[PDB]
Design an enzyme around this catalytic site. Structure first.
Site, short mmCIF file in Angstrom:
data_model
loop_
_atom_site.label_atom_id
_atom_site.label_comp_id
_atom_site.label_asym_id
_atom_site.label_seq_id
_atom_site.Cartn_x
_atom_site.Cartn_y
_atom_site.Cartn_z
N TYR A 1 75.34 3.57 18.79
CA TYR A 1 76.44 4.49 19.01
C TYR A 1 75.95 5.86 19.45
O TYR A 1 74.82 6.27 19.14
CB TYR A 1 77.32 4.60 17.75
N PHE B 1 76.66 14.66 23.17
CA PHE B 1 76.65 13.79 22.00
C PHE B 1 75.66 14.29 20.96
O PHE B 1 74.60 14.81 21.30
CB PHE B 1 76.28 12.37 22.45
N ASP B 2 76.00 14.10 19.68
CA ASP B 2 75.06 14.33 18.60
C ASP B 2 73.84 13.42 18.77
O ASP B 2 73.94 12.28 19.16
CB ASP B 2 75.76 14.06 17.28
N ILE C 1 84.39 5.59 8.68
CA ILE C 1 85.71 6.13 8.95
C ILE C 1 86.66 5.04 9.44
O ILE C 1 86.28 4.04 10.06
CB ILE C 1 85.67 7.32 9.93
N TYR D 1 87.82 12.43 9.60
CA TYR D 1 87.51 13.22 8.42
C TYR D 1 88.67 14.13 8.01
O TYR D 1 88.56 14.87 7.03
CB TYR D 1 86.26 14.07 8.63
N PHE E 1 83.50 8.57 20.38
CA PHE E 1 82.31 7.74 20.29
C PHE E 1 82.19 6.83 21.51
O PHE E 1 83.17 6.34 22.07
CB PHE E 1 82.33 6.82 19.07
C1 LIG Z 1 85.81 5.38 4.19
O1 LIG Z 1 85.69 6.65 4.79
C2 LIG Z 1 84.42 7.12 5.00
C3 LIG Z 1 83.27 6.40 4.77
C4 LIG Z 1 82.04 7.01 5.01
C5 LIG Z 1 81.95 8.30 5.39
C6 LIG Z 1 80.61 9.00 5.63
C7 LIG Z 1 80.33 9.24 7.10
C8 LIG Z 1 80.17 7.92 7.87
O2 LIG Z 1 80.22 8.22 9.33
C9 LIG Z 1 81.03 7.51 10.07
O3 LIG Z 1 81.81 6.72 9.59
C10 LIG Z 1 80.92 7.73 11.53
C11 LIG Z 1 80.96 6.39 12.25
C12 LIG Z 1 79.61 5.63 12.04
C13 LIG Z 1 78.51 6.41 12.59
C14 LIG Z 1 78.43 7.76 11.94
N1 LIG Z 1 79.73 8.48 11.97
C15 LIG Z 1 79.84 9.81 12.21
O4 LIG Z 1 80.93 10.40 12.02
C16 LIG Z 1 78.70 10.59 12.79
C17 LIG Z 1 79.18 11.94 13.43
C18 LIG Z 1 80.10 11.69 14.63
C19 LIG Z 1 80.62 13.02 15.19
C20 LIG Z 1 79.50 13.95 15.56
C21 LIG Z 1 78.59 14.17 14.41
C22 LIG Z 1 78.03 12.84 13.87
N2 LIG Z 1 77.63 10.81 11.81
C23 LIG Z 1 76.29 10.64 12.16
O5 LIG Z 1 76.01 10.12 13.24
C24 LIG Z 1 75.27 11.18 11.21
C25 LIG Z 1 73.90 10.66 11.62
C26 LIG Z 1 75.31 12.70 11.42
N3 LIG Z 1 75.48 10.79 9.81
C27 LIG Z 1 75.20 11.78 8.75
C28 LIG Z 1 75.49 9.47 9.53
O6 LIG Z 1 75.64 8.64 10.43
C29 LIG Z 1 75.23 9.08 8.11
O7 LIG Z 1 75.27 7.66 7.94
C30 LIG Z 1 76.51 7.09 7.75
C31 LIG Z 1 76.55 5.73 7.37
C32 LIG Z 1 77.78 5.14 7.10
C33 LIG Z 1 78.92 5.87 7.22
C34 LIG Z 1 78.92 7.18 7.62
C35 LIG Z 1 77.71 7.81 7.90
C36 LIG Z 1 83.12 9.05 5.61
C37 LIG Z 1 84.37 8.45 5.39
O8 LIG Z 1 85.55 9.04 5.56
C38 LIG Z 1 85.56 10.44 5.96
#
Ligand SMILES: COc1ccc(CC[C@H]2OC(=O)[C@@H]3CCCCN3C(=O)[C@@H](C3CCCCC3)NC(=O)C(C)(C)N(C)C(=O)COc3cccc2c3)cc1OC
Length: 128
Positions: A45, A55-56, A75, A101, A118
């Site tokens: 992703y 992109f991040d 999410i 979020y 994404f």
């Molecule tokens: C059930 O609801 C949730 C479950 C889990 C979470 C924690 C964050 C979760 O991230 C995501 O779901 C999305 C989609 C999967 C890839 C990572 N996601 C991000 O939002 C990105 C974000 C996108 C926008 C720009 C900034 C980055 N996050 C990331 O890529 C980074 C690396 C920054 N991040 C901290 C993680 O990917 C941590 O690992 C995760 C692993 C599983 C779920 C989440 C994050 C948040 C929730 O609700 C707010």
């Protein structure tokens, strides 16, 4: 750019029909199967705030991202969106805050009330 095109032309893949998760297929995948609730899915992703220039880049680009579909490990938009993808598909998703979020955000990278964008590549999926 892609976020604008997705807002204008993207398919509404929500149950509510609120255009809260919008999809355009970037690369057509294989077959007709999609992952099912509970399957382990494996993706690459790229994500960003929808108005960001870049992109991040804070995750490893090589290592698959793995989660169990439909179990609230990511999410809401990802549970809905990855469920629609064929193996090998690349898709664009544009996501309203209530499928991401919401009002809380996740500071500092994600402000309150953020629309996200994404690109997701579905690599593989498997059942229990
Ligand atoms: C059930 O609801 C949730 C479950 C889990 C979470 C924690 C964050 C979760 O991230 C995501 O779901 C999305 C989609 C999967 C890839 C990572 N996601 C991000 O939002 C990105 C974000 C996108 C926008 C720009 C900034 C980055 N996050 C990331 O890529 C980074 C690396 C920054 N991040 C901290 C993680 O990917 C941590 O690992 C995760 C692993 C599983 C779920 C989440 C994050 C948040 C929730 O609700 C707010």
């Amino acid at each position: 750019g892609a976020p604008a095109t997705v807002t204008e032309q993207g398919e509404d893949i929500t149950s509510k029909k609120d255009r809260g998760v919008l999809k355009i297929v970037k690369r057509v995948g294989n077959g007709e199967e999609t992952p099912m609730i509970g399957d382990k899915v494996y993706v690459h992703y790229k994500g960003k705030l929808s108005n960001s220039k870049k992109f991040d880049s804070s995750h490893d680009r090589n290592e698959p991202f793995v989660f169990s579909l439909g179990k609230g490990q990511v999410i809401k938009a990802w549970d809905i969106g990855v469920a629609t993808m064929k193996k090998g598909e690349i898709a664009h998703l544009l996501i309203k805050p209530e499928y991401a979020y919401g009002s809380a955000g996740s500071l500092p990278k994600i402000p309150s009330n953020a629309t996200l964008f994404f690109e997701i590549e579905l690599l593989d999926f498997k059942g229990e």
